[PDB]
Amino acid sequence: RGSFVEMVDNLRGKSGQGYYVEMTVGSPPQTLNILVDTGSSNFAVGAAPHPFLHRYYQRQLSSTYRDLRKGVYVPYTQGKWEGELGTDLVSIPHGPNVTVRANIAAITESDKFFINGSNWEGILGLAYAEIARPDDSLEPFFDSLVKQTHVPNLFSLQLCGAGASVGGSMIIGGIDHSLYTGSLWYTPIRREWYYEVIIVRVEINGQDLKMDCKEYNYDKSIVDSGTTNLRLPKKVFEAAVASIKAASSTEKFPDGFWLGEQLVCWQAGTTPWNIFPVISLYLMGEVTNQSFRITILPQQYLRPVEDVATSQDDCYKFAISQSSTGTVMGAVIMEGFYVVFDRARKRIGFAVSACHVHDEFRTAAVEGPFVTLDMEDCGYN
Ligand SMILES: N#Cc1ccc(C(=O)Nc2ccc(F)c([C@@]3(CF)N=C(N)OC[C@@H]3F)c2)nc1
Ligand code: NA
Ligand code: NA
């Protein structure tokens, strides 16, 4: 409890390609790098020689592989994979010292799923059975781990961005106190499917968007380490960029930029962070009529793009985007915070990350309590 030395710094990644952890599957163990995704619930690994893959799961080499005689076809908005279901022995070498028998979907065909030039070969979906494919009877990894071992039913994530290569920590079974500063503030998980939460107020530099808060959660809001952007419901995105545009009007940007349709560039070491506003989400708290507020900086929502062959300046992408799936607190939000997925008490904790990217004037912030009435009105049905 509170001290997990062996698990600190156990994530790696490249800017734009997500955070992965090393896992082993089968006997003898096959090492694979696996994307950590709190927005899905399947453990799915490449199992055929796709040319983007450094390596892949070779079921023939494993004496412990048990076939489930069942295929699965999984399309997403972007891309798709199909695979064959089975179970095998799984471990996390920089995670707890245990081996579990888990469902694995051996990916045998995929489109627009793997990233060319990335270093991972599968995804670890850490959300709940209700959204597992093909259905909720395919027990997700984390449920198998807690069912079969003494590992406590929680995990926490510190995702560290950069300004090159990313890193961070996934602490499985506890919280490590050196990963954050100040206090953890907790928000209820509204329903265990995605890690769904309820946003109760949104401010852009302390000015409130002043929308029916049902708008912030239409049709859900979720915490999701497998998406880069902060995604906002269309109506709220419209309000938010208009307010951010206005706060930054000391400089002008093409309109394409606010749509994530073009990048914007400054002379190296001259990004004007100061003209961009902080953005605060207030989340439903643990106590009736109580909320707390998280705040992110332009450093989280302006993402550097390197390997840009138009020019060799400092080029950024606006990473707040409109959504048709509700609010998505991706890496744009998580990179500011230590986030504790406290599945045993159905709640998510936030604290200021010990590693977040900041400057001399502003840091990301987690502050409470605030008095907010009618917070139950904010959830969408
Ligand atoms: N930061 C960051 C970051 C960059 C890339 C990636 C990435 O490629 N993720 C990724 C790639 C392929 C995926 F198919 C997913 C899924 C799998 F379910 N998971 C979520 N949650 O949303 C979309 C999709 F449903 C995520 N993730 C995080
Ligand atoms: Na247990
Ligand atoms: Na601490």
Side-chain angles (χ1 to χ4, degrees), residues 41-45 59 67-76 80-86 103-110 131-136 138:
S41 312
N42 284 79
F43 180 31
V45 315
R59 296 168 289 170
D67 203 321
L68 283 167
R69 314 218 141 69
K70 191 158 140 99
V72 70
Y73 181 86
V74 178
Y76 307 109
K80 103 223 177 332
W81 52 267
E82 343 173 343
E84 300 163 11
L85 300 174
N103 295 319
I104 312 181
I107 297 166
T108 58
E109 193 278 334
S110 64
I131 62 184
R133 321 286 176 94
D135 58 52
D136 70 344
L138 193 75

PDB file of all heavy atoms in Angstrom, residues 41-45 59 67-76 80-86 103-110 131-136 138:
ATOM      1  N   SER A  41     -12.475  -2.747 -23.438  1.00  0.00           N
ATOM      2  CA  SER A  41     -12.405  -3.819 -22.452  1.00  0.00           C
ATOM      3  C   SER A  41     -11.882  -5.155 -22.989  1.00  0.00           C
ATOM      4  O   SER A  41     -12.100  -6.167 -22.348  1.00  0.00           O
ATOM      5  CB  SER A  41     -13.817  -4.069 -21.858  1.00  0.00           C
ATOM      6  OG  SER A  41     -14.419  -2.841 -21.468  1.00  0.00           O
ATOM      7  N   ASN A  42     -11.297  -5.172 -24.188  1.00  0.00           N
ATOM      8  CA  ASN A  42     -10.702  -6.377 -24.744  1.00  0.00           C
ATOM      9  C   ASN A  42      -9.182  -6.375 -24.608  1.00  0.00           C
ATOM     10  O   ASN A  42      -8.546  -5.345 -24.839  1.00  0.00           O
ATOM     11  CB  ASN A  42     -11.083  -6.607 -26.236  1.00  0.00           C
ATOM     12  CG  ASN A  42     -12.507  -7.133 -26.397  1.00  0.00           C
ATOM     13  OD1 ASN A  42     -13.475  -6.361 -26.331  1.00  0.00           O
ATOM     14  ND2 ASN A  42     -12.650  -8.450 -26.572  1.00  0.00           N
ATOM     15  N   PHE A  43      -8.595  -7.542 -24.306  1.00  0.00           N
ATOM     16  CA  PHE A  43      -7.159  -7.720 -24.378  1.00  0.00           C
ATOM     17  C   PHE A  43      -6.939  -8.315 -25.798  1.00  0.00           C
ATOM     18  O   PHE A  43      -7.435  -9.432 -26.066  1.00  0.00           O
ATOM     19  CB  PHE A  43      -6.672  -8.662 -23.246  1.00  0.00           C
ATOM     20  CG  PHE A  43      -5.215  -8.874 -23.278  1.00  0.00           C
ATOM     21  CD1 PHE A  43      -4.374  -7.843 -23.765  1.00  0.00           C
ATOM     22  CD2 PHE A  43      -4.642 -10.101 -22.927  1.00  0.00           C
ATOM     23  CE1 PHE A  43      -2.997  -8.018 -23.794  1.00  0.00           C
ATOM     24  CE2 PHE A  43      -3.241 -10.270 -22.976  1.00  0.00           C
ATOM     25  CZ  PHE A  43      -2.419  -9.232 -23.406  1.00  0.00           C
ATOM     26  N   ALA A  44      -6.338  -7.583 -26.733  1.00  0.00           N
ATOM     27  CA  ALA A  44      -6.319  -8.035 -28.168  1.00  0.00           C
ATOM     28  C   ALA A  44      -4.895  -7.859 -28.697  1.00  0.00           C
ATOM     29  O   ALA A  44      -4.359  -6.772 -28.531  1.00  0.00           O
ATOM     30  CB  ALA A  44      -7.316  -7.224 -29.010  1.00  0.00           C
ATOM     31  N   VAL A  45      -4.250  -8.909 -29.241  1.00  0.00           N
ATOM     32  CA  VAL A  45      -2.847  -8.770 -29.661  1.00  0.00           C
ATOM     33  C   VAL A  45      -2.683  -9.242 -31.060  1.00  0.00           C
ATOM     34  O   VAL A  45      -3.384 -10.182 -31.485  1.00  0.00           O
ATOM     35  CB  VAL A  45      -1.866  -9.505 -28.708  1.00  0.00           C
ATOM     36  CG1 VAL A  45      -2.291  -9.167 -27.295  1.00  0.00           C
ATOM     37  CG2 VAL A  45      -2.028 -10.984 -28.788  1.00  0.00           C
ATOM     38  N   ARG A  59       0.675 -18.314 -31.084  1.00  0.00           N
ATOM     39  CA  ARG A  59      -0.060 -19.308 -30.254  1.00  0.00           C
ATOM     40  C   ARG A  59       0.536 -20.714 -30.349  1.00  0.00           C
ATOM     41  O   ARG A  59       0.480 -21.439 -29.401  1.00  0.00           O
ATOM     42  CB  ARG A  59      -1.545 -19.348 -30.606  1.00  0.00           C
ATOM     43  CG  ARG A  59      -2.212 -18.010 -30.274  1.00  0.00           C
ATOM     44  CD  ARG A  59      -3.579 -17.948 -30.872  1.00  0.00           C
ATOM     45  NE  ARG A  59      -3.460 -17.814 -32.297  1.00  0.00           N
ATOM     46  CZ  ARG A  59      -4.485 -17.916 -33.114  1.00  0.00           C
ATOM     47  NH1 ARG A  59      -5.673 -18.181 -32.605  1.00  0.00           N
ATOM     48  NH2 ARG A  59      -4.310 -17.726 -34.403  1.00  0.00           N
ATOM     49  N   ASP A  67      -7.712 -22.676 -26.893  1.00  0.00           N
ATOM     50  CA  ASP A  67      -8.652 -22.152 -27.870  1.00  0.00           C
ATOM     51  C   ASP A  67     -10.104 -22.063 -27.337  1.00  0.00           C
ATOM     52  O   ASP A  67     -10.612 -23.042 -26.799  1.00  0.00           O
ATOM     53  CB  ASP A  67      -8.652 -23.127 -29.049  1.00  0.00           C
ATOM     54  CG  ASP A  67      -9.113 -22.495 -30.352  1.00  0.00           C
ATOM     55  OD1 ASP A  67     -10.051 -21.671 -30.351  1.00  0.00           O
ATOM     56  OD2 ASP A  67      -8.535 -22.863 -31.412  1.00  0.00           O
ATOM     57  N   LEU A  68     -10.786 -20.929 -27.560  1.00  0.00           N
ATOM     58  CA  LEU A  68     -12.227 -20.802 -27.300  1.00  0.00           C
ATOM     59  C   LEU A  68     -13.192 -21.156 -28.506  1.00  0.00           C
ATOM     60  O   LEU A  68     -14.407 -21.089 -28.310  1.00  0.00           O
ATOM     61  CB  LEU A  68     -12.573 -19.443 -26.651  1.00  0.00           C
ATOM     62  CG  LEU A  68     -12.286 -19.215 -25.157  1.00  0.00           C
ATOM     63  CD1 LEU A  68     -12.402 -17.732 -24.875  1.00  0.00           C
ATOM     64  CD2 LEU A  68     -13.240 -20.016 -24.261  1.00  0.00           C
ATOM     65  N   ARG A  69     -12.654 -21.515 -29.693  1.00  0.00           N
ATOM     66  CA  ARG A  69     -13.400 -21.941 -30.885  1.00  0.00           C
ATOM     67  C   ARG A  69     -14.392 -20.863 -31.246  1.00  0.00           C
ATOM     68  O   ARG A  69     -15.533 -21.146 -31.548  1.00  0.00           O
ATOM     69  CB  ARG A  69     -14.098 -23.282 -30.671  1.00  0.00           C
ATOM     70  CG  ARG A  69     -13.221 -24.318 -30.019  1.00  0.00           C
ATOM     71  CD  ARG A  69     -13.417 -25.716 -30.565  1.00  0.00           C
ATOM     72  NE  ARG A  69     -12.090 -26.311 -30.619  1.00  0.00           N
ATOM     73  CZ  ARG A  69     -11.400 -26.621 -29.528  1.00  0.00           C
ATOM     74  NH1 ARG A  69     -11.952 -26.429 -28.334  1.00  0.00           N
ATOM     75  NH2 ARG A  69     -10.172 -27.111 -29.622  1.00  0.00           N
ATOM     76  N   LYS A  70     -13.990 -19.594 -31.181  1.00  0.00           N
ATOM     77  CA  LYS A  70     -14.934 -18.504 -31.377  1.00  0.00           C
ATOM     78  C   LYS A  70     -14.172 -17.308 -31.981  1.00  0.00           C
ATOM     79  O   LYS A  70     -13.135 -16.937 -31.474  1.00  0.00           O
ATOM     80  CB  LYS A  70     -15.553 -18.133 -30.020  1.00  0.00           C
ATOM     81  CG  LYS A  70     -16.749 -17.192 -30.013  1.00  0.00           C
ATOM     82  CD  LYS A  70     -17.560 -17.368 -28.719  1.00  0.00           C
ATOM     83  CE  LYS A  70     -18.068 -16.054 -28.135  1.00  0.00           C
ATOM     84  NZ  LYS A  70     -19.485 -15.662 -28.421  1.00  0.00           N
ATOM     85  N   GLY A  71     -14.689 -16.742 -33.073  1.00  0.00           N
ATOM     86  CA  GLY A  71     -14.111 -15.571 -33.727  1.00  0.00           C
ATOM     87  C   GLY A  71     -14.773 -14.286 -33.232  1.00  0.00           C
ATOM     88  O   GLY A  71     -15.788 -14.316 -32.558  1.00  0.00           O
ATOM     89  N   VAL A  72     -14.185 -13.139 -33.520  1.00  0.00           N
ATOM     90  CA  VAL A  72     -14.799 -11.861 -33.143  1.00  0.00           C
ATOM     91  C   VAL A  72     -14.403 -10.808 -34.205  1.00  0.00           C
ATOM     92  O   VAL A  72     -13.275 -10.843 -34.747  1.00  0.00           O
ATOM     93  CB  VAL A  72     -14.456 -11.513 -31.690  1.00  0.00           C
ATOM     94  CG1 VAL A  72     -12.987 -11.148 -31.513  1.00  0.00           C
ATOM     95  CG2 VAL A  72     -15.351 -10.409 -31.176  1.00  0.00           C
ATOM     96  N   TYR A  73     -15.365  -9.961 -34.576  1.00  0.00           N
ATOM     97  CA  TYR A  73     -15.181  -8.953 -35.607  1.00  0.00           C
ATOM     98  C   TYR A  73     -15.457  -7.620 -34.922  1.00  0.00           C
ATOM     99  O   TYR A  73     -16.537  -7.412 -34.414  1.00  0.00           O
ATOM    100  CB  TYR A  73     -16.146  -9.173 -36.764  1.00  0.00           C
ATOM    101  CG  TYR A  73     -15.974  -8.166 -37.878  1.00  0.00           C
ATOM    102  CD1 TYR A  73     -15.022  -8.382 -38.890  1.00  0.00           C
ATOM    103  CD2 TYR A  73     -16.738  -6.969 -37.921  1.00  0.00           C
ATOM    104  CE1 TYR A  73     -14.825  -7.462 -39.933  1.00  0.00           C
ATOM    105  CE2 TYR A  73     -16.563  -6.039 -38.950  1.00  0.00           C
ATOM    106  CZ  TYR A  73     -15.603  -6.292 -39.957  1.00  0.00           C
ATOM    107  OH  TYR A  73     -15.382  -5.402 -40.984  1.00  0.00           O
ATOM    108  N   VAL A  74     -14.480  -6.727 -34.872  1.00  0.00           N
ATOM    109  CA  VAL A  74     -14.582  -5.548 -34.006  1.00  0.00           C
ATOM    110  C   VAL A  74     -14.313  -4.301 -34.847  1.00  0.00           C
ATOM    111  O   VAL A  74     -13.162  -3.972 -35.142  1.00  0.00           O
ATOM    112  CB  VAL A  74     -13.551  -5.622 -32.879  1.00  0.00           C
ATOM    113  CG1 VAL A  74     -13.609  -4.366 -31.973  1.00  0.00           C
ATOM    114  CG2 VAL A  74     -13.758  -6.907 -32.080  1.00  0.00           C
ATOM    115  N   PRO A  75     -15.375  -3.637 -35.299  1.00  0.00           N
ATOM    116  CA  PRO A  75     -15.099  -2.405 -35.999  1.00  0.00           C
ATOM    117  C   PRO A  75     -15.211  -1.198 -35.080  1.00  0.00           C
ATOM    118  O   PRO A  75     -15.990  -1.210 -34.161  1.00  0.00           O
ATOM    119  CB  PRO A  75     -16.195  -2.369 -37.054  1.00  0.00           C
ATOM    120  CG  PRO A  75     -17.284  -3.292 -36.532  1.00  0.00           C
ATOM    121  CD  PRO A  75     -16.796  -3.983 -35.323  1.00  0.00           C
ATOM    122  N   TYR A  76     -14.465  -0.150 -35.351  1.00  0.00           N
ATOM    123  CA  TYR A  76     -14.594   1.096 -34.582  1.00  0.00           C
ATOM    124  C   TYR A  76     -14.951   2.172 -35.601  1.00  0.00           C
ATOM    125  O   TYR A  76     -14.997   1.906 -36.814  1.00  0.00           O
ATOM    126  CB  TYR A  76     -13.272   1.465 -33.912  1.00  0.00           C
ATOM    127  CG  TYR A  76     -12.619   0.372 -33.050  1.00  0.00           C
ATOM    128  CD1 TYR A  76     -11.461  -0.265 -33.493  1.00  0.00           C
ATOM    129  CD2 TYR A  76     -13.153   0.006 -31.765  1.00  0.00           C
ATOM    130  CE1 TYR A  76     -10.848  -1.222 -32.700  1.00  0.00           C
ATOM    131  CE2 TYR A  76     -12.550  -0.996 -30.971  1.00  0.00           C
ATOM    132  CZ  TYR A  76     -11.384  -1.563 -31.441  1.00  0.00           C
ATOM    133  OH  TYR A  76     -10.723  -2.521 -30.693  1.00  0.00           O
ATOM    134  N   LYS A  80     -10.693  -1.374 -37.797  1.00  0.00           N
ATOM    135  CA  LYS A  80     -11.382  -2.596 -37.413  1.00  0.00           C
ATOM    136  C   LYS A  80     -10.364  -3.674 -37.233  1.00  0.00           C
ATOM    137  O   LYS A  80      -9.279  -3.585 -37.781  1.00  0.00           O
ATOM    138  CB  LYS A  80     -12.473  -2.963 -38.465  1.00  0.00           C
ATOM    139  CG  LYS A  80     -12.137  -4.091 -39.451  1.00  0.00           C
ATOM    140  CD  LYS A  80     -12.546  -3.796 -40.911  1.00  0.00           C
ATOM    141  CE  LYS A  80     -12.115  -4.926 -41.887  1.00  0.00           C
ATOM    142  NZ  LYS A  80     -10.890  -5.693 -41.443  1.00  0.00           N
ATOM    143  N   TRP A  81     -10.669  -4.664 -36.412  1.00  0.00           N
ATOM    144  CA  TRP A  81      -9.893  -5.934 -36.483  1.00  0.00           C
ATOM    145  C   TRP A  81     -10.798  -7.113 -36.325  1.00  0.00           C
ATOM    146  O   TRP A  81     -11.919  -6.907 -35.826  1.00  0.00           O
ATOM    147  CB  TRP A  81      -8.802  -5.964 -35.440  1.00  0.00           C
ATOM    148  CG  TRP A  81      -9.241  -5.670 -34.071  1.00  0.00           C
ATOM    149  CD1 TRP A  81      -9.239  -4.434 -33.463  1.00  0.00           C
ATOM    150  CD2 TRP A  81      -9.701  -6.620 -33.029  1.00  0.00           C
ATOM    151  NE1 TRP A  81      -9.678  -4.538 -32.170  1.00  0.00           N
ATOM    152  CE2 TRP A  81      -9.966  -5.818 -31.843  1.00  0.00           C
ATOM    153  CE3 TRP A  81      -9.920  -7.998 -32.975  1.00  0.00           C
ATOM    154  CZ2 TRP A  81     -10.436  -6.377 -30.637  1.00  0.00           C
ATOM    155  CZ3 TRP A  81     -10.360  -8.563 -31.742  1.00  0.00           C
ATOM    156  CH2 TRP A  81     -10.621  -7.765 -30.606  1.00  0.00           C
ATOM    157  N   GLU A  82     -10.370  -8.314 -36.770  1.00  0.00           N
ATOM    158  CA  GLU A  82     -11.066  -9.573 -36.510  1.00  0.00           C
ATOM    159  C   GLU A  82     -10.029 -10.490 -35.880  1.00  0.00           C
ATOM    160  O   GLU A  82      -8.777 -10.433 -36.171  1.00  0.00           O
ATOM    161  CB  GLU A  82     -11.559 -10.240 -37.793  1.00  0.00           C
ATOM    162  CG  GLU A  82     -11.609  -9.311 -38.968  1.00  0.00           C
ATOM    163  CD  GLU A  82     -11.932 -10.016 -40.261  1.00  0.00           C
ATOM    164  OE1 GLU A  82     -11.792 -11.269 -40.296  1.00  0.00           O
ATOM    165  OE2 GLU A  82     -12.298  -9.304 -41.241  1.00  0.00           O
ATOM    166  N   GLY A  83     -10.495 -11.377 -35.030  1.00  0.00           N
ATOM    167  CA  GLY A  83      -9.559 -12.242 -34.356  1.00  0.00           C
ATOM    168  C   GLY A  83     -10.126 -13.536 -33.852  1.00  0.00           C
ATOM    169  O   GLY A  83     -11.275 -13.772 -34.039  1.00  0.00           O
ATOM    170  N   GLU A  84      -9.313 -14.358 -33.199  1.00  0.00           N
ATOM    171  CA  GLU A  84      -9.801 -15.650 -32.701  1.00  0.00           C
ATOM    172  C   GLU A  84      -9.613 -15.580 -31.206  1.00  0.00           C
ATOM    173  O   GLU A  84      -8.548 -15.142 -30.752  1.00  0.00           O
ATOM    174  CB  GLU A  84      -9.008 -16.811 -33.302  1.00  0.00           C
ATOM    175  CG  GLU A  84      -9.104 -16.855 -34.837  1.00  0.00           C
ATOM    176  CD  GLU A  84      -8.033 -17.719 -35.532  1.00  0.00           C
ATOM    177  OE1 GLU A  84      -7.279 -18.505 -34.870  1.00  0.00           O
ATOM    178  OE2 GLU A  84      -7.931 -17.587 -36.774  1.00  0.00           O
ATOM    179  N   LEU A  85     -10.651 -15.944 -30.453  1.00  0.00           N
ATOM    180  CA  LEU A  85     -10.611 -15.926 -28.990  1.00  0.00           C
ATOM    181  C   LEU A  85      -9.960 -17.157 -28.376  1.00  0.00           C
ATOM    182  O   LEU A  85     -10.118 -18.270 -28.859  1.00  0.00           O
ATOM    183  CB  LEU A  85     -11.998 -15.744 -28.406  1.00  0.00           C
ATOM    184  CG  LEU A  85     -12.734 -14.468 -28.799  1.00  0.00           C
ATOM    185  CD1 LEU A  85     -14.136 -14.629 -28.195  1.00  0.00           C
ATOM    186  CD2 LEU A  85     -12.051 -13.224 -28.254  1.00  0.00           C
ATOM    187  N   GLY A  86      -9.178 -16.951 -27.335  1.00  0.00           N
ATOM    188  CA  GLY A  86      -8.584 -18.046 -26.595  1.00  0.00           C
ATOM    189  C   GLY A  86      -8.225 -17.567 -25.206  1.00  0.00           C
ATOM    190  O   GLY A  86      -8.494 -16.452 -24.856  1.00  0.00           O
ATOM    191  N   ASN A 103      -8.594 -14.111 -21.086  1.00  0.00           N
ATOM    192  CA  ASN A 103      -9.027 -14.022 -22.482  1.00  0.00           C
ATOM    193  C   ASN A 103      -8.049 -13.177 -23.284  1.00  0.00           C
ATOM    194  O   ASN A 103      -7.629 -12.109 -22.800  1.00  0.00           O
ATOM    195  CB  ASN A 103     -10.432 -13.397 -22.550  1.00  0.00           C
ATOM    196  CG  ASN A 103     -11.460 -14.305 -21.883  1.00  0.00           C
ATOM    197  OD1 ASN A 103     -11.423 -15.561 -22.058  1.00  0.00           O
ATOM    198  ND2 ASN A 103     -12.390 -13.713 -21.137  1.00  0.00           N
ATOM    199  N   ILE A 104      -7.706 -13.653 -24.487  1.00  0.00           N
ATOM    200  CA  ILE A 104      -6.925 -12.943 -25.418  1.00  0.00           C
ATOM    201  C   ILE A 104      -7.628 -13.125 -26.775  1.00  0.00           C
ATOM    202  O   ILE A 104      -8.013 -14.223 -27.161  1.00  0.00           O
ATOM    203  CB  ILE A 104      -5.503 -13.563 -25.564  1.00  0.00           C
ATOM    204  CG1 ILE A 104      -4.895 -13.801 -24.201  1.00  0.00           C
ATOM    205  CG2 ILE A 104      -4.515 -12.632 -26.273  1.00  0.00           C
ATOM    206  CD1 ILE A 104      -3.487 -14.378 -24.243  1.00  0.00           C
ATOM    207  N   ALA A 105      -7.756 -12.037 -27.522  1.00  0.00           N
ATOM    208  CA  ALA A 105      -8.250 -12.067 -28.893  1.00  0.00           C
ATOM    209  C   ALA A 105      -6.965 -11.997 -29.716  1.00  0.00           C
ATOM    210  O   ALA A 105      -6.190 -11.044 -29.594  1.00  0.00           O
ATOM    211  CB  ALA A 105      -9.131 -10.833 -29.121  1.00  0.00           C
ATOM    212  N   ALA A 106      -6.688 -13.056 -30.479  1.00  0.00           N
ATOM    213  CA  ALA A 106      -5.533 -13.119 -31.329  1.00  0.00           C
ATOM    214  C   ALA A 106      -6.024 -12.440 -32.624  1.00  0.00           C
ATOM    215  O   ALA A 106      -6.906 -13.015 -33.369  1.00  0.00           O
ATOM    216  CB  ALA A 106      -5.143 -14.590 -31.602  1.00  0.00           C
ATOM    217  N   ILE A 107      -5.462 -11.252 -32.895  1.00  0.00           N
ATOM    218  CA  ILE A 107      -5.819 -10.497 -34.092  1.00  0.00           C
ATOM    219  C   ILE A 107      -5.226 -11.125 -35.353  1.00  0.00           C
ATOM    220  O   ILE A 107      -4.001 -11.188 -35.550  1.00  0.00           O
ATOM    221  CB  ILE A 107      -5.442  -9.048 -33.975  1.00  0.00           C
ATOM    222  CG1 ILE A 107      -6.220  -8.350 -32.819  1.00  0.00           C
ATOM    223  CG2 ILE A 107      -5.709  -8.286 -35.266  1.00  0.00           C
ATOM    224  CD1 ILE A 107      -5.573  -7.007 -32.494  1.00  0.00           C
ATOM    225  N   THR A 108      -6.102 -11.539 -36.240  1.00  0.00           N
ATOM    226  CA  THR A 108      -5.630 -12.217 -37.436  1.00  0.00           C
ATOM    227  C   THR A 108      -5.805 -11.342 -38.665  1.00  0.00           C
ATOM    228  O   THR A 108      -5.247 -11.650 -39.716  1.00  0.00           O
ATOM    229  CB  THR A 108      -6.344 -13.593 -37.643  1.00  0.00           C
ATOM    230  OG1 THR A 108      -7.739 -13.375 -37.730  1.00  0.00           O
ATOM    231  CG2 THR A 108      -6.107 -14.537 -36.447  1.00  0.00           C
ATOM    232  N   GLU A 109      -6.592 -10.278 -38.568  1.00  0.00           N
ATOM    233  CA  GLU A 109      -6.761  -9.336 -39.704  1.00  0.00           C
ATOM    234  C   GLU A 109      -7.087  -7.949 -39.132  1.00  0.00           C
ATOM    235  O   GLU A 109      -7.873  -7.841 -38.203  1.00  0.00           O
ATOM    236  CB  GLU A 109      -7.908  -9.765 -40.636  1.00  0.00           C
ATOM    237  CG  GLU A 109      -7.928  -9.005 -41.983  1.00  0.00           C
ATOM    238  CD  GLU A 109      -8.593  -7.590 -41.975  1.00  0.00           C
ATOM    239  OE1 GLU A 109      -9.488  -7.287 -41.122  1.00  0.00           O
ATOM    240  OE2 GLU A 109      -8.236  -6.753 -42.862  1.00  0.00           O
ATOM    241  N   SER A 110      -6.506  -6.896 -39.656  1.00  0.00           N
ATOM    242  CA  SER A 110      -6.862  -5.583 -39.127  1.00  0.00           C
ATOM    243  C   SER A 110      -6.827  -4.490 -40.213  1.00  0.00           C
ATOM    244  O   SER A 110      -6.055  -4.604 -41.135  1.00  0.00           O
ATOM    245  CB  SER A 110      -5.905  -5.232 -38.011  1.00  0.00           C
ATOM    246  OG  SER A 110      -4.588  -5.099 -38.504  1.00  0.00           O
ATOM    247  N   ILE A 131     -18.903  -3.516 -21.991  1.00  0.00           N
ATOM    248  CA  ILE A 131     -18.545  -3.141 -23.387  1.00  0.00           C
ATOM    249  C   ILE A 131     -17.506  -4.040 -24.003  1.00  0.00           C
ATOM    250  O   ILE A 131     -16.912  -3.682 -25.046  1.00  0.00           O
ATOM    251  CB  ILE A 131     -18.098  -1.666 -23.565  1.00  0.00           C
ATOM    252  CG1 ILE A 131     -16.831  -1.429 -22.738  1.00  0.00           C
ATOM    253  CG2 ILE A 131     -19.221  -0.720 -23.077  1.00  0.00           C
ATOM    254  CD1 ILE A 131     -16.353   0.008 -22.749  1.00  0.00           C
ATOM    255  N   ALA A 132     -17.296  -5.217 -23.403  1.00  0.00           N
ATOM    256  CA  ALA A 132     -16.412  -6.157 -24.033  1.00  0.00           C
ATOM    257  C   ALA A 132     -17.039  -6.690 -25.370  1.00  0.00           C
ATOM    258  O   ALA A 132     -18.277  -6.762 -25.476  1.00  0.00           O
ATOM    259  CB  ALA A 132     -16.111  -7.295 -23.058  1.00  0.00           C
ATOM    260  N   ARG A 133     -16.223  -7.084 -26.351  1.00  0.00           N
ATOM    261  CA  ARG A 133     -16.743  -7.791 -27.533  1.00  0.00           C
ATOM    262  C   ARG A 133     -16.350  -9.242 -27.449  1.00  0.00           C
ATOM    263  O   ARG A 133     -15.253  -9.534 -26.996  1.00  0.00           O
ATOM    264  CB  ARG A 133     -16.185  -7.247 -28.821  1.00  0.00           C
ATOM    265  CG  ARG A 133     -16.013  -5.759 -28.893  1.00  0.00           C
ATOM    266  CD  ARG A 133     -17.302  -4.988 -29.053  1.00  0.00           C
ATOM    267  NE  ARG A 133     -16.915  -3.586 -29.009  1.00  0.00           N
ATOM    268  CZ  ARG A 133     -16.647  -2.799 -30.064  1.00  0.00           C
ATOM    269  NH1 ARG A 133     -16.774  -3.212 -31.349  1.00  0.00           N
ATOM    270  NH2 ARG A 133     -16.276  -1.539 -29.818  1.00  0.00           N
ATOM    271  N   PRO A 134     -17.198 -10.164 -27.934  1.00  0.00           N
ATOM    272  CA  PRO A 134     -18.491  -9.935 -28.556  1.00  0.00           C
ATOM    273  C   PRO A 134     -19.599  -9.514 -27.605  1.00  0.00           C
ATOM    274  O   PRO A 134     -20.571  -8.933 -28.066  1.00  0.00           O
ATOM    275  CB  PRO A 134     -18.837 -11.302 -29.176  1.00  0.00           C
ATOM    276  CG  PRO A 134     -18.160 -12.272 -28.280  1.00  0.00           C
ATOM    277  CD  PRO A 134     -16.840 -11.600 -27.947  1.00  0.00           C
ATOM    278  N   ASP A 135     -19.477  -9.801 -26.304  1.00  0.00           N
ATOM    279  CA  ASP A 135     -20.499  -9.456 -25.328  1.00  0.00           C
ATOM    280  C   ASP A 135     -19.893  -9.579 -23.934  1.00  0.00           C
ATOM    281  O   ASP A 135     -18.706  -9.878 -23.789  1.00  0.00           O
ATOM    282  CB  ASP A 135     -21.737 -10.376 -25.462  1.00  0.00           C
ATOM    283  CG  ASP A 135     -21.382 -11.847 -25.300  1.00  0.00           C
ATOM    284  OD1 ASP A 135     -20.730 -12.195 -24.275  1.00  0.00           O
ATOM    285  OD2 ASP A 135     -21.707 -12.663 -26.219  1.00  0.00           O
ATOM    286  N   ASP A 136     -20.734  -9.414 -22.916  1.00  0.00           N
ATOM    287  CA  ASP A 136     -20.281  -9.093 -21.600  1.00  0.00           C
ATOM    288  C   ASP A 136     -19.891 -10.328 -20.856  1.00  0.00           C
ATOM    289  O   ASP A 136     -19.526 -10.274 -19.682  1.00  0.00           O
ATOM    290  CB  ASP A 136     -21.328  -8.253 -20.863  1.00  0.00           C
ATOM    291  CG  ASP A 136     -22.617  -9.047 -20.483  1.00  0.00           C
ATOM    292  OD1 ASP A 136     -22.920 -10.154 -20.989  1.00  0.00           O
ATOM    293  OD2 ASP A 136     -23.355  -8.538 -19.637  1.00  0.00           O
ATOM    294  N   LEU A 138     -17.403 -12.155 -21.969  1.00  0.00           N
ATOM    295  CA  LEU A 138     -15.959 -12.275 -22.128  1.00  0.00           C
ATOM    296  C   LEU A 138     -15.279 -11.399 -21.068  1.00  0.00           C
ATOM    297  O   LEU A 138     -15.118 -10.164 -21.232  1.00  0.00           O
ATOM    298  CB  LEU A 138     -15.526 -11.878 -23.530  1.00  0.00           C
ATOM    299  CG  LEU A 138     -14.072 -12.308 -23.767  1.00  0.00           C
ATOM    300  CD1 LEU A 138     -13.986 -13.822 -23.986  1.00  0.00           C
ATOM    301  CD2 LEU A 138     -13.386 -11.492 -24.886  1.00  0.00           C
TER     302      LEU A 138
END
